[PDB]
Design an enzyme around this catalytic site. Structure first.
Site, PDB file in Angstrom:
ATOM      1  N   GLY A  19       0.802  -1.206   0.000  1.00  0.00           N
ATOM      2  CA  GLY A  19       0.000   0.000   0.000  1.00  0.00           C
ATOM      3  C   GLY A  19       0.835   1.256   0.000  1.00  0.00           C
ATOM      4  O   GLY A  19       0.304   2.350  -0.213  1.00  0.00           O
ATOM      5  N   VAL A  22       8.260   4.261   0.019  1.00  0.00           N
ATOM      6  CA  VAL A  22       8.896   5.431   0.583  1.00  0.00           C
ATOM      7  C   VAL A  22      10.243   5.690  -0.070  1.00  0.00           C
ATOM      8  O   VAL A  22      11.033   4.767  -0.297  1.00  0.00           O
ATOM      9  CB  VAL A  22       8.966   5.364   2.129  1.00  0.00           C
ATOM     10  CG1 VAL A  22       8.520   3.990   2.658  1.00  0.00           C
ATOM     11  CG2 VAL A  22      10.337   5.767   2.632  1.00  0.00           C
ATOM     12  N   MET A  86      15.497   8.322   8.605  1.00  0.00           N
ATOM     13  CA  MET A  86      16.197   7.575   9.646  1.00  0.00           C
ATOM     14  C   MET A  86      17.292   6.748   8.983  1.00  0.00           C
ATOM     15  O   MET A  86      17.036   5.682   8.423  1.00  0.00           O
ATOM     16  CB  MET A  86      15.238   6.674  10.429  1.00  0.00           C
ATOM     17  CG  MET A  86      14.155   7.422  11.212  1.00  0.00           C
ATOM     18  SD  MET A  86      14.755   8.300  12.693  1.00  0.00           S
ATOM     19  CE  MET A  86      14.808   6.987  13.899  1.00  0.00           C
ATOM     20  N   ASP A 130      -0.281  -0.929  14.198  1.00  0.00           N
ATOM     21  CA  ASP A 130       0.590  -1.670  13.312  1.00  0.00           C
ATOM     22  C   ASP A 130       2.005  -1.715  13.920  1.00  0.00           C
ATOM     23  O   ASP A 130       2.985  -1.275  13.318  1.00  0.00           O
ATOM     24  CB  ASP A 130       0.586  -1.007  11.941  1.00  0.00           C
ATOM     25  CG  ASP A 130       1.165  -1.887  10.852  1.00  0.00           C
ATOM     26  OD1 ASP A 130       1.424  -1.348   9.752  1.00  0.00           O
ATOM     27  OD2 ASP A 130       1.364  -3.100  11.084  1.00  0.00           O
ATOM     28  N   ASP A 157      -9.979   3.665   7.637  1.00  0.00           N
ATOM     29  CA  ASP A 157     -11.057   3.166   6.783  1.00  0.00           C
ATOM     30  C   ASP A 157     -10.601   2.836   5.371  1.00  0.00           C
ATOM     31  O   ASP A 157     -10.844   1.743   4.871  1.00  0.00           O
ATOM     32  CB  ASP A 157     -12.217   4.163   6.707  1.00  0.00           C
ATOM     33  CG  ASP A 157     -12.961   4.289   8.019  1.00  0.00           C
ATOM     34  OD1 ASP A 157     -12.841   3.372   8.871  1.00  0.00           O
ATOM     35  OD2 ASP A 157     -13.669   5.303   8.197  1.00  0.00           O
TER      36      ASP A 157
HETATM   37  N1  LIG Z   1      11.177   7.587   7.831  1.00  0.00           N
HETATM   38  C1  LIG Z   1      11.928   6.564   7.240  1.00  0.00           C
HETATM   39  N2  LIG Z   1      13.276   6.618   7.199  1.00  0.00           N
HETATM   40  C2  LIG Z   1      13.999   5.655   6.654  1.00  0.00           C
HETATM   41  N3  LIG Z   1      13.432   4.590   6.117  1.00  0.00           N
HETATM   42  C3  LIG Z   1      12.098   4.429   6.099  1.00  0.00           C
HETATM   43  C4  LIG Z   1      11.286   5.427   6.666  1.00  0.00           C
HETATM   44  N4  LIG Z   1       9.995   5.015   6.511  1.00  0.00           N
HETATM   45  C5  LIG Z   1       9.956   3.870   5.905  1.00  0.00           C
HETATM   46  N5  LIG Z   1      11.228   3.464   5.632  1.00  0.00           N
HETATM   47  C6  LIG Z   1      11.623   2.225   4.945  1.00  0.00           C
HETATM   48  O1  LIG Z   1      10.621   1.846   3.977  1.00  0.00           O
HETATM   49  C7  LIG Z   1      10.334   0.436   4.144  1.00  0.00           C
HETATM   50  C8  LIG Z   1       8.897   0.106   3.712  1.00  0.00           C
HETATM   51  O2  LIG Z   1       8.016   0.983   4.388  1.00  0.00           O
HETATM   52  P1  LIG Z   1       6.458   0.699   4.528  1.00  0.00           P
HETATM   53  O3  LIG Z   1       5.676   1.150   3.201  1.00  0.00           O
HETATM   54  O4  LIG Z   1       5.908   1.418   5.698  1.00  0.00           O
HETATM   55  O5  LIG Z   1       6.225  -0.865   4.705  1.00  0.00           O
HETATM   56  P2  LIG Z   1       6.785  -1.959   5.701  1.00  0.00           P
HETATM   57  O6  LIG Z   1       6.711  -1.240   7.145  1.00  0.00           O
HETATM   58  O7  LIG Z   1       8.155  -2.342   5.283  1.00  0.00           O
HETATM   59  N6  LIG Z   1       5.866  -3.364   5.597  1.00  0.00           N
HETATM   60  P3  LIG Z   1       4.214  -3.122   5.726  1.00  0.00           P
HETATM   61  O8  LIG Z   1       3.863  -2.493   7.164  1.00  0.00           O
HETATM   62  O9  LIG Z   1       3.507  -4.555   5.549  1.00  0.00           O
HETATM   63  O10 LIG Z   1       3.704  -2.198   4.696  1.00  0.00           O
HETATM   64  C9  LIG Z   1      10.517   0.179   5.652  1.00  0.00           C
HETATM   65  O11 LIG Z   1      10.806  -1.203   5.931  1.00  0.00           O
HETATM   66  C10 LIG Z   1      11.754   1.033   5.907  1.00  0.00           C
HETATM   67  O12 LIG Z   1      12.859   0.240   5.518  1.00  0.00           O
HETATM   68  C1  LIG Z   2      -3.960   3.452   8.987  1.00  0.00           C
HETATM   69  N1  LIG Z   2      -3.359   4.804   9.220  1.00  0.00           N
HETATM   70  C2  LIG Z   2      -3.943   5.895   9.779  1.00  0.00           C
HETATM   71  N2  LIG Z   2      -3.057   6.920   9.786  1.00  0.00           N
HETATM   72  C3  LIG Z   2      -1.894   6.454   9.237  1.00  0.00           C
HETATM   73  C4  LIG Z   2      -0.642   7.030   8.977  1.00  0.00           C
HETATM   74  F1  LIG Z   2      -0.465   8.324   9.313  1.00  0.00           F
HETATM   75  C5  LIG Z   2       0.394   6.292   8.390  1.00  0.00           C
HETATM   76  N3  LIG Z   2       1.622   6.836   8.137  1.00  0.00           N
HETATM   77  C6  LIG Z   2       2.462   7.485   9.019  1.00  0.00           C
HETATM   78  C7  LIG Z   2       2.065   7.829  10.316  1.00  0.00           C
HETATM   79  C8  LIG Z   2       2.895   8.515  11.184  1.00  0.00           C
HETATM   80  C9  LIG Z   2       4.181   8.862  10.764  1.00  0.00           C
HETATM   81 BR1  LIG Z   2       5.362   9.782  11.949  1.00  0.00          BR
HETATM   82  C10 LIG Z   2       4.605   8.517   9.476  1.00  0.00           C
HETATM   83  C11 LIG Z   2       3.752   7.836   8.607  1.00  0.00           C
HETATM   84 CL1  LIG Z   2       4.360   7.420   6.962  1.00  0.00          CL
HETATM   85  C12 LIG Z   2       0.162   4.957   8.055  1.00  0.00           C
HETATM   86  C13 LIG Z   2       1.176   4.099   7.358  1.00  0.00           C
HETATM   87  O1  LIG Z   2       2.091   4.622   6.720  1.00  0.00           O
HETATM   88  N4  LIG Z   2       1.008   2.777   7.323  1.00  0.00           N
HETATM   89  O2  LIG Z   2       1.919   2.010   6.635  1.00  0.00           O
HETATM   90  C14 LIG Z   2       1.475   0.902   5.829  1.00  0.00           C
HETATM   91  C15 LIG Z   2       2.361   0.688   4.601  1.00  0.00           C
HETATM   92  O3  LIG Z   2       2.338   1.847   3.756  1.00  0.00           O
HETATM   93  C16 LIG Z   2      -1.077   4.390   8.289  1.00  0.00           C
HETATM   94  C17 LIG Z   2      -2.101   5.131   8.884  1.00  0.00           C
HETATM   95 MG   LIG Z   3       4.937   0.245   7.295  1.00  0.00          MG
END
Ligand SMILES: Nc1ncnc2c1ncn2[C@@H]1O[C@H](COP(=O)(O)OP(=O)(O)NP(=O)(O)O)[C@@H](O)[C@H]1O
Ligand SMILES: Cn1cnc2c(F)c(Nc3ccc(Br)cc3Cl)c(C(=O)NOCCO)cc21
Ligand SMILES: [Mg+2]
Length: 291
Positions: A19, A22, A86, A130, A157
Site C-alpha cells: 500500500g 517510501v 532515519m 501496526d 477506513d
Molecule cells: N522515515 C523513514 N526513514 C527511513 N526509512 C524508512 C522510513 N519510513 C519507511 N522506511 C523504509 O521503507 C520500508 C517500507 O516501508 P512501509 O511502506 O511502511 O512498509 P513496511 O513497514 O516495510 N511493511 P508493511 O507495514 O507490511 O507495509 C521500511 O521497511 C523502511 O525500511
Molecule cells: C492506517 N493509518 C492511519 N493513519 C496512518 C498514517 F499516518 C500512516 N503513516 C504514518 C504515520 C505517522 C508517521 Br510519523 C509517518 C507515517 Cl508514513 C500509516 C502508514 O504509513 N502505514 O503504513 C502501511 C504501509 O504503507 C497508516 C495510517
Molecule cells: Mg509500514
C-alpha cells in the site's frame, strides 16, 4: 513552510511494502533530506482532503520516540507523508543484517516502544495499530522511534482491505471487532521475540532448530495457530528470566489479563534495561556498516 510535489527531487528508494512506497528525497527549497511515503488511493477528493486534514495532527506528535513529521499532501492518486529520514532503517532491516538482536539492545527498544505508545495514547488518545519491526525506525544517534501509527481515522477506513503470511495481530483483533490498545501490547511482544530469536516466531522452533540457532504456512493455518495454540515463549536458558516474564506478560491471549503500558513501564526487565549502560548507536553502525 508548505510542501508541494515539484519542490522535491528523488534520491533513492528506501523500500516498499503493501500500500506504500517510501523514497529518500531532497526537499529543494530547504535542503532537508526527508523520507517521503507515497500511498496510492483511488478515492474521491472529499475524503482525501479529510485524510490530509487528519494527518496534520502529526505536526504535534513530537517525541524522541516518535518519528518526525514534516508535512502531508496529495499529488496524483498519491498521498505523500514526508518524514524524518532515519539513516539506520527499520528494525526488520537491522534484523536481517544482524541475524539476532542482543537482549540488552532489545531492552532499549522495549523502552522506546513503551514510551512511544504511552506518548501517543497519553497525549493524543491514539492507538498504534501496526506495531512490528519495520515500523520501528532507528538512526546513527541511537534514537529509536515509532512510525506508521494510525493517526487518521479515515485512513484507517480507506486502507481497511489490503496482509500476507505474517501477522502481528493480537488474537482478539484477528477474531473480531472487540479490540483496542491492548492489541499493540501483543504486537510488541511478538516483535520482540522475533527480533530476539532471528525469525518470525510462529510456529515456535522445534527442539532441533533451537539448538542450531544457539515450509511457509498457509494463511488460515497460521491465524489458527495464533488464536488457538498457546503463545510463543522465549526459549529458556539464553534469556534472563526478567526478559522471559516481560514478553510472557505481553503475550497473554486475554487482552484484559495481558499487561498494560502502565505495568510494563515498571516491569523488572524495563527497570533493569533502564539502568544498563548500552552504546546502542555504536552497536547499530557496527552491525550494519556505517559511521
Ligand atoms: N522515515 C523513514 N526513514 C527511513 N526509512 C524508512 C522510513 N519510513 C519507511 N522506511 C523504509 O521503507 C520500508 C517500507 O516501508 P512501509 O511502506 O511502511 O512498509 P513496511 O513497514 O516495510 N511493511 P508493511 O507495514 O507490511 O507495509 C521500511 O521497511 C523502511 O525500511
Ligand atoms: C492506517 N493509518 C492511519 N493513519 C496512518 C498514517 F499516518 C500512516 N503513516 C504514518 C504515520 C505517522 C508517521 Br510519523 C509517518 C507515517 Cl508514513 C500509516 C502508514 O504509513 N502505514 O503504513 C502501511 C504501509 O504503507 C497508516 C495510517
Ligand atoms: Mg509500514
Amino acid at each position: 513552510m508548505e510542501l508541494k510535489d515539484d519542490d522535491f527531487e528523488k534520491i533513492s528508494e528506501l523500500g516498499a511494502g503493501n500500500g506504500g512506497v517510501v523514497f529518500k528525497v531532497s526537499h529543494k527549497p530547504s535542503g532537508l533530506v526527508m523520507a517521503r511515503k507515497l500511498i496510492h488511493l483511488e478515492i474521491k477528493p472529499a475524503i482525501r482532503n479529510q485524510i490530509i486534514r487528519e494527518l496534520q495532527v502529526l505536526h504535534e506528535c513530537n517525541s524522541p520516540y516518535i518519528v518526525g513529521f514534516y508535512g502531508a499532501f496529495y499529488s496524483d492518486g498519491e498521498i505523500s507523508i514526508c518524514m524524518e529520514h532515519m539513516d539506520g532503517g527499520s528494525l526488520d532491516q537491522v534484523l536481517k543484517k544482524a541475524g539476532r538482536i542482543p537482549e540488552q539492545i532489545l531492552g532499549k527498544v522495549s523502552i522506546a516502544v513503551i514510551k512511544g505508545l504511552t506518548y501517543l495514547r497519553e497525549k493524543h488518545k491514539i492507538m498504534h495499530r501496526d506495531v512490528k519491526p519495520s515500523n520501528i525506525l532507528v538512526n546513527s544517534r541511537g534514537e529509536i522511534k515509532l512510525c506508521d501509527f494510525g493517526v487518521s481515522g479515515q485512513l484507517i477506513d480507506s486502507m481497511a482491505n489490503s496482509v500476507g503470511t505474517r501477522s502481528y495481530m493480537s488474537p482478539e483483533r484477528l477474531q473480531g471487532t472487540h479490540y483496542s490498545v491492548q492489541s499493540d501490547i501483543w504486537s510488541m511482544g511478538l516483535s520482540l521475540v522475533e527480533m530476539a530469536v532471528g525469525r518470525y516466531p510462529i510456529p515456535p522452533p522445534d527442539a532441533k532448530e533451537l539448538e542450531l540457532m544457539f515450509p511457509p504456512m498457509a494463511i488460515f493455518e497460521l491465524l489458527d495457530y495464533i488464536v488457538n495454540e498457546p503463545p510463543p515463549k522465549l526459549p529458556s536458558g539464553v534469556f534472563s528470566l526478567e526478559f522471559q516474564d516481560f514478553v510472557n506478560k505481553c503475550l497473554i491471549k486475554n487482552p484484559a489479563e495481558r499487561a498494560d503500558l502502565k505495568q510494563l513501564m515498571v516491569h523488572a526487565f524495563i527497570k533493569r534495561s533502564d539502568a544498563e549502560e548500552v552504546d546502542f548507536a555504536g552497536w547499530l553502525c557496527s552491525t550494519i556498516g556505517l559511521n
